[PDB]
Design a protein around this nucleic acid. Sequence first.
RNA 1: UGGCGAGUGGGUGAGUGAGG
DNA 2: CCTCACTCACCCACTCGCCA
Length: 149
Amino acid sequence: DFVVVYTDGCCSSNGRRRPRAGIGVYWGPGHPLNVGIRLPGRQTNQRAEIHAACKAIEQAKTQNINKLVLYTNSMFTINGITNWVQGWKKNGWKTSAGKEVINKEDFVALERLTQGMDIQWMHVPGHSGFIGNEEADRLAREGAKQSED
RNA sequence: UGGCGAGUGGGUGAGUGAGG
DNA sequence: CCTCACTCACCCACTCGCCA
Ligand SMILES: [Ca+2]
Ligand SMILES: [Ca+2]
Ligand SMILES: [Ca+2]
C-alpha cells in the first residue's frame, strides 16, 4: 500500500564562498526514478534537504502514488513540515527570536506538494542507516558536482 | 510599539573546510 | 579512527546594539 523512499540534501562548502548544493532520491535497486540533481536557487544544505523531499513527492505524483514513507536525516525538514508550519501560519511566519522564517519559500513549496499526499516522515541516523540512506547521500553528493541547467 | 542586526546556552539534527 | 576551523536553521527564552 505504501512506498519507501530515501532522500538527502547536501552542499559542498556550505556557508563558504562558493557553495554547491545537490539532492538525491532513492526508490529501489536500479530504480529509473533514482536521481541526483544540482539544486537551483540559494545554495544551502537546509534548502537541499527540503527540496530533496520535494522531488520525491514530485515523482510519486507522476506515478499515481499517494501513500509514501519518506526517509531523511534532516530533523529540520521533518519537524518543520510536521510541526512548525502550523504555528508559522498562525504567527505570520516568525521564528522564536521574532525574525522571519528563512526557508519559508521551501516549506511552502513542500506543504503545497503534500496536499492529497499521505506521507509518513521517518528520520534516518545519518551515519548509522542502511544502504538506502548511504546511497541517497551519494546521489546528492554527485548531483552537487554538476552545473545547473 | 514597529522595523533591523548581533549575542547568550541548552535541545534537534544536518552540511562542510584544513590536516594525520 | 584522530585533530583543529566553520555555517545551515529551527525549538526553548532573555540580553545587547541600530532606526522611527
Ligand atoms: Ca528551486
Ligand atoms: Ca524591538
Ligand atoms: Ca552535529
